Amino acid sequence: GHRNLVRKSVRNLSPAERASLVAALKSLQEDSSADGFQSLASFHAQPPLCPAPAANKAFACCVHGMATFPEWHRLYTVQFEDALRRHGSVVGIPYWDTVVPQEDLPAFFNDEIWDDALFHANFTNPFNGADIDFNHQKIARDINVDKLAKEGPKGYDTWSFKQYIYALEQEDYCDFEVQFEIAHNAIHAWVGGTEEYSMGHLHYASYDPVFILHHSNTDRLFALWQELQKFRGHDPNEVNCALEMMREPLKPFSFGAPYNLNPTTKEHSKPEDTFDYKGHFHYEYDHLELQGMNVQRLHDYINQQKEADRVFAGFLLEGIGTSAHLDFSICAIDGECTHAGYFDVLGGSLETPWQFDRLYKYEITDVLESKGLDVHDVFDIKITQTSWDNEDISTDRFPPPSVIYVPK
Amino acid sequence: GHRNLVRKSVRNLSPAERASLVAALKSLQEDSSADGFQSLASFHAQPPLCPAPAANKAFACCVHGMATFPEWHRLYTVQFEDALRRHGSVVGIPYWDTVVPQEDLPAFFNDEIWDDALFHANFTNPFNGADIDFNHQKIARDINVDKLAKEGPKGYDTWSFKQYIYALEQEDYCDFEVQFEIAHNAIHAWVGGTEEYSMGHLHYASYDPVFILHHSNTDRLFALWQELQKFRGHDPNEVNCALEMMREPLKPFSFGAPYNLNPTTKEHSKPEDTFDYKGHFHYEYDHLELQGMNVQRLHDYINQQKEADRVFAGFLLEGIGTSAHLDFSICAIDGECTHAGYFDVLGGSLETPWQFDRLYKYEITDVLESKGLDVHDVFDIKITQTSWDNEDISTDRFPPPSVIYVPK
Amino acid sequence: GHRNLVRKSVRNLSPAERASLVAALKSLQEDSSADGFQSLASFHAQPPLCPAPAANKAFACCVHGMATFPEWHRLYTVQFEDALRRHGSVVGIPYWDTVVPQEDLPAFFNDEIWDDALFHANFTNPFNGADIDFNHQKIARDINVDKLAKEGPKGYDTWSFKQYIYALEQEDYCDFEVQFEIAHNAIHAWVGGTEEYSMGHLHYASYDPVFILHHSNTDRLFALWQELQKFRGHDPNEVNCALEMMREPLKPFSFGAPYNLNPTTKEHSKPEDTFDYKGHFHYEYDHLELQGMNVQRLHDYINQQKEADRVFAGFLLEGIGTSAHLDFSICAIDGECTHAGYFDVLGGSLETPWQFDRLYKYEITDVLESKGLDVHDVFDIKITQTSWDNEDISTDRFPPPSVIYVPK
Amino acid sequence: GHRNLVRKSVRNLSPAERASLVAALKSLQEDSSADGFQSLASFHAQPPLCPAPAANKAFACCVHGMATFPEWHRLYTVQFEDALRRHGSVVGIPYWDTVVPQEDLPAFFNDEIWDDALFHANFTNPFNGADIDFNHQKIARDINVDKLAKEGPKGYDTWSFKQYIYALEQEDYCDFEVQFEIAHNAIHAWVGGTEEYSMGHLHYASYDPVFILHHSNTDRLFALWQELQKFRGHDPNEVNCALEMMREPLKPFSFGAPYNLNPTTKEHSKPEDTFDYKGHFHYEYDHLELQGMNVQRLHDYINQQKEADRVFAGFLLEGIGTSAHLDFSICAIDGECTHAGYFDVLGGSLETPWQFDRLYKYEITDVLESKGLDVHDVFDIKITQTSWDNEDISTDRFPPPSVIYVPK
Ligand SMILES: CC(=O)N[C@@H]1[C@@H](O)[C@H](O)[C@@H](CO)O[C@H]1O
Ligand SMILES: CC(=O)N[C@@H]1[C@@H](O)[C@H](O)[C@@H](CO)O[C@H]1O
Ligand SMILES: CC(=O)N[C@@H]1[C@@H](O)[C@H](O)[C@@H](CO)O[C@H]1O
Ligand SMILES: [Cu+2]
Ligand SMILES: [Cu+2]
Ligand SMILES: [Cu+2]
Ligand SMILES: [Cu+2]
Ligand SMILES: [Cu+2]
Ligand SMILES: [Cu+2]
Ligand SMILES: [Cu+2]
């Protein structure tokens, strides 16, 4: 990078860059050290250790369902970087930008073997699996849905684009968050699938190697939002919202030794001061941009989205239990529904209670125009949460959604 | 007039006017028909009449914590106003402005003896109380806060003013309601105080005649907003918010006979169609202002409110149980606090569940500062919610209040 | 043992008569013996002593949800009757008919105390409640809908009438026990309202005496149907239906000593062997007429109904595990629903799962008509399930009601 | 588009005719388009594309176990027929009638190869199997019971005859689809015997063409019933039954583009709108007679049956998740059982759970008679369930069969 470690597409890496990361985590993996892989995992969920790392009832950590979410996870990736160079990660933990239709799957983390046979090495792509220690099983993803190589009625017109872009449109940090965070979940799910020990499970994603690679990109999106904020005229590290959490540290990052042998994360635990990453954490992205759209190109695209009447459904997420996913559709008066959109929440047991202080908006303008329906009409919205396993979830007490309207 | 009634303050009510009114409800109070007083009372709460009078588990029947709240309560006064009409009234249901500091509690409804001219009579003040029949009980009032009688750092800048005015600084209807309603909640308590049977108890609170009086000033100022919105450029009769509910016919009004003999309110159960009062209900307010400044002077006021940094506490109101009061204090790092502010909610144990889909912000600016406190100063915030009875209710699971900051 | 008995209405009871029964159960209720009250109480459901009385997992021995229900409960009133006799009774167990709107609560079972009145002295009305020793608890009551009195959109046609009359229409023993049972569910509800230890709970209900009182009026209908059929041309005592189970001994009446010291009760445990009560069980009814109408008049009243197009909703009952109650409305394409009817089951932790082999029908012609609708027009139809202890039951997994059309 | 079609028997087919269809499907089977074979194949069950085609948990879109089954499969033969036409076909999809003992296997679908024979040349018989691309597998067959040929304790009365004849007796649309479906189950079994990828599996079966062939002979009976009824006095196109679902659009035929490029198919997705095939779907049958017997002769043959006491067993089907087959005998009190009958369902991992709202009946008079037994005598009745892949299915939890008696 500048010195700043540069985080890049796990895709356009160097045979060398790659190699380094391979040996790196390979080592990292059997680093029984407090700041060794396997204990880092114990941060995000199981074994939990948050109220304290051993007090009464152990809630797991990882600010999920709250504002101070990205800050937490931001420390975590770095907590993994300032962890790879411990093993000579010649570079910064690369990102797997799911935001774009990926036909073939990135080989960096799909291969189960790796012939360093040119050099002296020939085995498993450590960046393709790990072993859950205490819970003695194997993270084994079930991508199941490789329709993460899907839609785009216009090509780039895909889920994540719609998701992030909107997220990005938000100017109030907190508005941006709920949305930003829901896209996070997508990939948690799109990979863990219907399996237990995997990326689709609060308690276990940490264990899988791709975790880093994804949050690396989510935190790359986060960055992308700061940068756009700056371009809009706002201080990108200014959070005037939720100023009750930002000051409160961030466990265990704040725990110090001997659970976190890092000092920067430690010193930088109060989210408040974790926004401007480049300073406190020297690392950066090669291209703060979304799907080859310049920061000015993004802004600009957004304001063109604003050029017309739009229609959204609001979601009051209170989420609890295991992570689940939900579909919703626009039923017409005699009952003519159309799949309108979907989203998923990550979660488990030890999750720490959470309820968004606000709605999760989700555009439906299109599905509506298609079906010849306007905001002046009678149409009802219908949902069905569903567990990470064929278990229909009662959509009863679950507050019905609003149906916002954003003119101009 | 032909196709309108006019609403004045109880305090500008010429004996002429109030005479009509005294004999009106008096007659009303004796109307045993489905659109006579007693009847026209449960429409609110007890006895339950809402899923359907015939249903098994029955809830209240009035929209609370919900964007359609004002329209319902607005539709309700029309219901009363129309009965008085049917009973020799010649004026609209007067509003008891509680905005301005009350020197004493108005005559119209305070004394309990209507003597006066023409008939040379001498009998009870119908507008001073009725009595709950089904319950064999009788209405009550307990103004344990009459110190509601003028507080105000700089004079006319009083609580409910502070309150109702913020609310007006808001063009996102839902945003304004979640504030416009908490305001309204105050009198509900300022009057019933602690009487299990009174303006302070979701259930019987519709039987005391102030209900109407009060709910007329609210309806008043709500009309105000509309007006104000006009002066801001927006369509004062369009709500591009919560449309999923702005369309569900408001019961009982949507019941028609034999529960609701009034036609122009079935014809209007849809909130959607309750915004245009003068026109669908033909009833006007004498004036449209709030404590002095006109619609304009209003707009030309709030702005000033926006010329300085402000600091709010947001409250995530899931509300449920019985009516109850919450007060909150800012606590300095050390251990001492200062009374922050306080709001209250009205709520029977016969209410349909309800949780707001947005935070309920309230200003702690000054207080904070008058405590040598900066928006960026390490400080906590403890809350207290006690019933109307006096059981301290454990907030152990009440979501901690945020601490929003505000630019400009 | 020797002598017939004539069961009378719980109103045309002569103080001599009443006296014999008052003193009888009084004695019964102190009969510690296996054929004593607290014990005969057990036969229905709790303490369960079912497949056997000693095996690991046990259930409430009573038949519910199955074809063979009316026999089980028939043997049971006999079991109790013979027992009342054994203690001095000399009249059959009276029946509290409720197809007729009760304007008050029959003395027999309501007085808190009774007066020998044939020697004058005070004792508590044994037919007014009882203890429940194993549970160390006491029955209780709650006449919930004493609004049962409240009935008759056109006179005597009360819910139960419509309800039983229909059951009497069906000429197939099976198609009819569907209705006849679901009818025998109402009093259960209307006497135990929300109280856990009462009639509304499979477990304790047979602990309260009004059960005997009820199930005597049901068996009164069962005999009556037996007339309507004989009058119709059929041999009462045989059924062209369900023969798979009409011969499986009923428990525990079959056990014999030591859980059933009664021999007629046992020897006649096979339901087929109990259709001709008087012959097997010496006992008859003062009268067999619903609303005082002849078996002939019934056969007339029915066909007369067989004269218009009707319309019914279809219910596939299965039974939760707790007594519940659902009422279904019948919303228009508009979104304006309209209460149309209801029924309730009698569930219980300790039951043996059951589902009726056919649908339970329930006419909606009328409600339809009074809404400008008919079988060809478009209408939807909604349900809402509630537990006895106010607790909405998820109806998500509840096969939707079908809507029939019956010509003639 | 324009022109009627007459569906013929798969035997009285003229080489010209056959030719048009042979070349047609041949073409069809190479139609990669949404309305191509491999795709139209999907409509039934696998690949599932059901509630919607993109939501998380998906099911086989086909209706089974429900009232609305005969329409679904009716729209489906049309969906395929129009498609055969689109490729050159000019005759309706023939029907392989099997109510009549097939002594051989009809050429149409059996020759491994065919000879243009109207220009002479070899091509493979497209109506003889197909590939199944998604599964990367190929249909297969196993005529298991080519012992189907084997039938007739007294001639033409083959299992299917007894079976269908009965379905035609019932005059209630619903009571009859119970039989009519369970009948449409036999060929499924008798063609796919033990082979996983064949007709005996909900998933793949519509992949083999003889399905079309079958479901054309079923729809042939469905029309026939429609005669017997019209002849009986009823309006074919309406049903006095199940109206709750006769108007719920069938999937995916309703979807439209891009999963159903057919418009008649969609526009007529509501089952009510499909009873009068010829009118909606241009197409008829050469004949409508079971065993060559007139609609009149049927109405005669039936009543004639309505002339003796019969006896039936009762089955409450629910459906496992896999196609199964059970056969019930009817053991004496002796311990000497006697095969009495059987039937089989068509299950599948991917189904939408269903249970019939009523029992499925199946007569045992005869077997009873030939054993010196009748409805009053004592006899028990046993079942044995086996999977297609030899695997005894636990019948422990399977509501026992009831045994009816039908006089007249
Ligand atoms: C995976 C691979 O490249 N194949 C090699 C194989 O050619 C070789 O015979 C062997 C020596 O034991 O190691 C294998 O498994
Ligand atoms: C059996 C074993 O150790 N696995 C080897 C692996 O090391 C090597 O990378 C691969 C290609 O040479 O050949 C496999 O057979
Ligand atoms: C003369 C009279 O009765 N009318 C009074 C008036 O003097 C007073 O100014 C007004 C409030 O400003 O209230 C009216 O009722
Ligand atoms: Cu996380
Ligand atoms: Cu209210
Ligand atoms: Cu109110
Ligand atoms: Cu019972
Ligand atoms: Cu005496
Ligand atoms: Cu099928
Ligand atoms: Cu030739």
mmCIF file of N, CA, C and O in Angstrom, chain C residues 85-121:
data_model
loop_
_atom_site.group_PDB
_atom_site.id
_atom_site.type_symbol
_atom_site.label_atom_id
_atom_site.label_comp_id
_atom_site.label_asym_id
_atom_site.label_seq_id
_atom_site.Cartn_x
_atom_site.Cartn_y
_atom_site.Cartn_z
ATOM 1 N N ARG C 85 -77.194 -43.480 42.886
ATOM 2 C CA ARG C 85 -78.019 -44.518 43.429
ATOM 3 C C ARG C 85 -77.351 -45.267 44.638
ATOM 4 O O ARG C 85 -77.893 -45.243 45.715
ATOM 5 N N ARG C 86 -76.198 -45.928 44.447
ATOM 6 C CA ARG C 86 -75.492 -46.712 45.480
ATOM 7 C C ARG C 86 -75.513 -45.932 46.784
ATOM 8 O O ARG C 86 -75.501 -46.481 47.927
ATOM 9 N N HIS C 87 -75.541 -44.608 46.637
ATOM 10 C CA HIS C 87 -75.659 -43.816 47.847
ATOM 11 C C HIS C 87 -77.109 -43.277 47.965
ATOM 12 O O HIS C 87 -77.285 -42.114 48.144
ATOM 13 N N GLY C 88 -78.155 -44.028 47.819
ATOM 14 C CA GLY C 88 -79.373 -43.381 48.163
ATOM 15 C C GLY C 88 -80.111 -42.643 47.092
ATOM 16 O O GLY C 88 -81.340 -42.403 47.235
ATOM 17 N N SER C 89 -79.464 -42.288 46.003
ATOM 18 C CA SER C 89 -80.269 -41.623 45.002
ATOM 19 C C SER C 89 -81.384 -42.481 44.462
ATOM 20 O O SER C 89 -81.299 -43.734 44.389
ATOM 21 N N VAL C 90 -82.434 -41.816 44.032
ATOM 22 C CA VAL C 90 -83.540 -42.597 43.478
ATOM 23 C C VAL C 90 -84.101 -41.925 42.277
ATOM 24 O O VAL C 90 -85.251 -42.156 41.889
ATOM 25 N N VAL C 91 -83.303 -41.084 41.688
ATOM 26 C CA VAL C 91 -83.810 -40.529 40.490
ATOM 27 C C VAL C 91 -82.587 -40.412 39.639
ATOM 28 O O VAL C 91 -81.463 -40.400 40.181
ATOM 29 N N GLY C 92 -82.779 -40.383 38.312
ATOM 30 C CA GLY C 92 -81.666 -40.469 37.394
ATOM 31 C C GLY C 92 -81.011 -39.156 37.413
ATOM 32 O O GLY C 92 -81.662 -38.189 37.813
ATOM 33 N N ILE C 93 -79.776 -39.116 36.947
ATOM 34 C CA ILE C 93 -79.086 -37.854 36.905
ATOM 35 C C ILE C 93 -79.718 -36.757 35.994
ATOM 36 O O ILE C 93 -79.676 -36.901 34.790
ATOM 37 N N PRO C 94 -80.249 -35.653 36.524
ATOM 38 C CA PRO C 94 -80.997 -34.716 35.713
ATOM 39 C C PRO C 94 -80.095 -34.164 34.703
ATOM 40 O O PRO C 94 -78.924 -34.334 34.862
ATOM 41 N N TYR C 95 -80.657 -33.491 33.703
ATOM 42 C CA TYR C 95 -79.954 -32.920 32.543
ATOM 43 C C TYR C 95 -80.172 -31.431 32.602
ATOM 44 O O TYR C 95 -81.264 -30.992 32.781
ATOM 45 N N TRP C 96 -79.136 -30.647 32.479
ATOM 46 C CA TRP C 96 -79.267 -29.203 32.325
ATOM 47 C C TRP C 96 -79.373 -28.862 30.832
ATOM 48 O O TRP C 96 -78.369 -28.615 30.185
ATOM 49 N N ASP C 97 -80.587 -28.848 30.281
ATOM 50 C CA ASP C 97 -80.707 -28.528 28.903
ATOM 51 C C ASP C 97 -80.286 -27.130 28.705
ATOM 52 O O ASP C 97 -80.622 -26.312 29.497
ATOM 53 N N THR C 98 -79.465 -26.873 27.666
ATOM 54 C CA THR C 98 -79.043 -25.491 27.358
ATOM 55 C C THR C 98 -79.369 -25.177 25.900
ATOM 56 O O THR C 98 -79.203 -24.079 25.512
ATOM 57 N N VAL C 99 -79.822 -26.094 25.077
ATOM 58 C CA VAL C 99 -80.290 -25.560 23.842
ATOM 59 C C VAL C 99 -81.292 -24.403 24.149
ATOM 60 O O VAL C 99 -81.655 -23.630 23.287
ATOM 61 N N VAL C 100 -81.788 -24.251 25.350
ATOM 62 C CA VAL C 100 -82.741 -23.171 25.487
ATOM 63 C C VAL C 100 -82.160 -22.040 26.254
ATOM 64 O O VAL C 100 -81.797 -22.211 27.351
ATOM 65 N N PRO C 101 -82.279 -20.827 25.836
ATOM 66 C CA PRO C 101 -81.541 -19.759 26.496
ATOM 67 C C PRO C 101 -81.869 -19.790 27.941
ATOM 68 O O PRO C 101 -83.002 -19.651 28.308
ATOM 69 N N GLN C 102 -80.873 -20.012 28.766
ATOM 70 C CA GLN C 102 -81.029 -19.895 30.198
ATOM 71 C C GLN C 102 -80.950 -18.387 30.601
ATOM 72 O O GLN C 102 -79.974 -17.674 30.405
ATOM 73 N N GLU C 103 -82.001 -17.917 31.192
ATOM 74 C CA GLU C 103 -82.052 -16.539 31.590
ATOM 75 C C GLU C 103 -81.383 -16.374 32.973
ATOM 76 O O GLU C 103 -80.937 -15.272 33.355
ATOM 77 N N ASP C 104 -81.320 -17.480 33.704
ATOM 78 C CA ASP C 104 -80.672 -17.536 35.021
ATOM 79 C C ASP C 104 -79.879 -18.807 35.138
ATOM 80 O O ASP C 104 -79.919 -19.640 34.244
ATOM 81 N N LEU C 105 -79.230 -18.983 36.286
ATOM 82 C CA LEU C 105 -78.517 -20.214 36.526
ATOM 83 C C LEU C 105 -79.287 -21.153 37.432
ATOM 84 O O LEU C 105 -79.590 -20.859 38.541
ATOM 85 N N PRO C 106 -79.623 -22.319 36.939
ATOM 86 C CA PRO C 106 -80.434 -23.239 37.727
ATOM 87 C C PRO C 106 -79.894 -23.405 39.097
ATOM 88 O O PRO C 106 -78.657 -23.659 39.290
ATOM 89 N N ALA C 107 -80.833 -23.228 40.031
ATOM 90 C CA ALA C 107 -80.616 -23.420 41.440
ATOM 91 C C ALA C 107 -79.832 -24.696 41.725
ATOM 92 O O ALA C 107 -78.749 -24.661 42.328
ATOM 93 N N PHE C 108 -80.387 -25.816 41.248
ATOM 94 C CA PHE C 108 -79.862 -27.138 41.531
ATOM 95 C C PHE C 108 -78.457 -27.024 41.721
ATOM 96 O O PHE C 108 -77.962 -27.452 42.688
ATOM 97 N N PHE C 109 -77.779 -26.376 40.829
ATOM 98 C CA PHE C 109 -76.356 -26.412 40.950
ATOM 99 C C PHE C 109 -75.806 -25.037 41.339
ATOM 100 O O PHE C 109 -74.550 -24.826 41.527
ATOM 101 N N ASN C 110 -76.689 -24.071 41.493
ATOM 102 C CA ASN C 110 -76.057 -22.840 41.799
ATOM 103 C C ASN C 110 -76.038 -22.361 43.241
ATOM 104 O O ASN C 110 -75.121 -21.666 43.695
ATOM 105 N N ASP C 111 -77.027 -22.745 44.003
ATOM 106 C CA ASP C 111 -77.062 -22.208 45.353
ATOM 107 C C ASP C 111 -75.767 -22.528 46.000
ATOM 108 O O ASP C 111 -75.242 -23.561 45.834
ATOM 109 N N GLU C 112 -75.240 -21.627 46.750
ATOM 110 C CA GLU C 112 -74.049 -21.953 47.418
ATOM 111 C C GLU C 112 -74.431 -22.993 48.531
ATOM 112 O O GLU C 112 -73.711 -23.977 48.806
ATOM 113 N N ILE C 113 -75.593 -22.808 49.142
ATOM 114 C CA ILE C 113 -76.038 -23.768 50.141
ATOM 115 C C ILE C 113 -77.411 -24.198 49.842
ATOM 116 O O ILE C 113 -78.160 -23.476 49.115
ATOM 117 N N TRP C 114 -77.749 -25.358 50.429
ATOM 118 C CA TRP C 114 -79.117 -25.884 50.346
ATOM 119 C C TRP C 114 -79.753 -26.151 51.709
ATOM 120 O O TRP C 114 -79.040 -26.267 52.669
ATOM 121 N N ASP C 115 -81.084 -26.231 51.765
ATOM 122 C CA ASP C 115 -81.836 -26.470 52.996
ATOM 123 C C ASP C 115 -82.657 -27.754 52.936
ATOM 124 O O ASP C 115 -83.690 -27.765 52.289
ATOM 125 N N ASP C 116 -82.213 -28.825 53.606
ATOM 126 C CA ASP C 116 -82.958 -30.101 53.616
ATOM 127 C C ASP C 116 -84.363 -29.874 53.141
ATOM 128 O O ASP C 116 -84.907 -30.589 52.256
ATOM 129 N N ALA C 117 -84.981 -28.912 53.800
ATOM 130 C CA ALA C 117 -86.321 -28.625 53.387
ATOM 131 C C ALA C 117 -87.126 -29.956 53.124
ATOM 132 O O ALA C 117 -87.444 -30.298 51.945
ATOM 133 N N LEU C 118 -87.396 -30.666 54.245
ATOM 134 C CA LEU C 118 -88.180 -31.896 54.336
ATOM 135 C C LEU C 118 -87.733 -32.476 55.674
ATOM 136 O O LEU C 118 -87.871 -33.705 55.905
ATOM 137 N N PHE C 119 -87.181 -31.558 56.498
ATOM 138 C CA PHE C 119 -86.599 -31.749 57.877
ATOM 139 C C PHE C 119 -85.735 -30.543 58.349
ATOM 140 O O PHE C 119 -85.266 -30.488 59.509
ATOM 141 N N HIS C 120 -85.501 -29.639 57.377
ATOM 142 C CA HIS C 120 -84.882 -28.292 57.495
ATOM 143 C C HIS C 120 -83.574 -28.187 58.143
ATOM 144 O O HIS C 120 -83.582 -28.311 59.343
ATOM 145 N N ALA C 121 -82.505 -27.883 57.403
ATOM 146 C CA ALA C 121 -81.154 -27.845 57.940
ATOM 147 C C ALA C 121 -80.206 -27.446 56.848
ATOM 148 O O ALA C 121 -80.493 -27.576 55.701
#
